[PDB]
């Protein structure tokens with residue numbers, strides 16, 4: 001899907017996490033964030049379409065999503081341990097990584 005679409009999918013699941021009561025609801029929404037992050041990583045923006053994969057611009061674009069995914073995975077570790085509130089606090093911190101990965105390319 002579109003980059004704008006994946007940014008919305010991430011924003012929708014972050015709200016779900018903030019409103020969640022249990023770890024399984026957090027786990028589900030983080031799972032869907034990870035999928036959207038890996039999808040967004042494929043949605044090369046038009047201004048970058050003709051860049052080489054080896055290019056520094058494409059390194060920057062792709063690795064913003066590796067970093068988002070890294071911390072989604074860390075949050076999933078907390079959810080799978082049933083630490084709902086800790087996982088919710090990690091998710092709040094995903095907003096900054098999401099911004100860093102997506103904002104300047106929209």
Ligand SMILES: [Fe+3]
Nearest residue numbers: 067068070071
């Ligand atoms: Fe990090």
